[PDB]
Amino acid sequence: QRAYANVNTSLADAMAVNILNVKDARTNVFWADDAIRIVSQPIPANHELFAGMKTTSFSIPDVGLNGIFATQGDISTLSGLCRIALWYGVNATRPEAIGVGLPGQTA
Amino acid sequence: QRAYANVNTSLADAMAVNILNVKDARTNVFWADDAIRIVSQPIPANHELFAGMKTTSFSIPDVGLNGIFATQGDISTLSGLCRIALWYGVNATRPEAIGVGLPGQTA
After folding, report:
1. What does the similarity note say (chains A, B)?
2. Pair B73, B79: CB distance under 8 Å
3. Is B61 on the interface with A (CB under 8 A)?
4. Smallest Cβ distance to B48: which of A52, A54, A74?
5. Secondary structure E strands in chain A
């Protein structure tokens, strides 16, 4: 367990908890390129179980993710619904490799 | 402007307004034809926004207005709905040409 140590000493009884962001600051974010990742899952709205509505694959332009474009009509109201759904999760596997740059940290 | 004058003289400071509905009489109507206009519009429920519902044109040839015929069934009841919608407006574009005949007006 001590092979994974990242700090010289343990959290003592009543050490002070220094706060770094003492002033509002727009952040400069830096990381190592693999420390952050997006995880996507398909939404199977094209399955035969969803027969009523019309489902097409939807492309998100730049991020390289795929969603679904669904439309369904109601006859009692003569109104239709359009849904674009995208399923993903942003994960930080290496938070220790991600950093934030906070300038003007006074008062 | 004077080319459109339809009345001998304007309304004075105080001239009595003569009521002409003095008895409840069923109306007789006369007009010059095409004084009434029927404005009709389509209902685009055949658009892709309406996917679970089956929509087709519906002609009512007795008058000359095309309506919409739509059907949509649900699986939980194994029942379907049928809607026949007609969108129109009745407009009296020449009210001076429409006339009303009122018999037995004495009060």
Report:
1. Belongs to the P22 phage major capsid protein family.
2. yes
3. no
4. A54
5. 28-31, 36-40, 54-59, 66-74, 79-85, 88-92, 98-101
Q: How far apart are CA B78 and CA A96, in angstroms?
A: 58
Contact A9, A81 (CB under 8 A): no
Q: Which residues of chain B make contact with A74, given a CB cutoff of 8 A?
A: 50, 52-53, 72
Q: Which residue bears the tokens 């009523």?
A: A52
CB-CB under 8 Å, A78 with B49: no
Reported resolution in A? 2.8
Residue labelled with tokens 């006859």? A75
Q: How far apart are CA A51 and CA B72, in angstroms?
A: 12
Q: What technique solved it?
A: cryo-EM
Shortest CA gap B9–chain A (Å) = 52
Chain B contact for A74 (CB, 8 A cutoff): yes
Task: Give the Cα separation of B38 and B64 in Å (integer).
Answer: 10
The single-letter DSSP state of residue A7 is S
**What's the length of chain B?**
107
A8: left (phi over 0), alpha (psi -120 to 50) or beta: alpha
- CB burial of residue A13 (10 Å; 0-12, 13-18, 19+): exposed
For chain B, what percentages of helix, strand and coil (3-state, to nearest 5) are there? 5, 40, 60
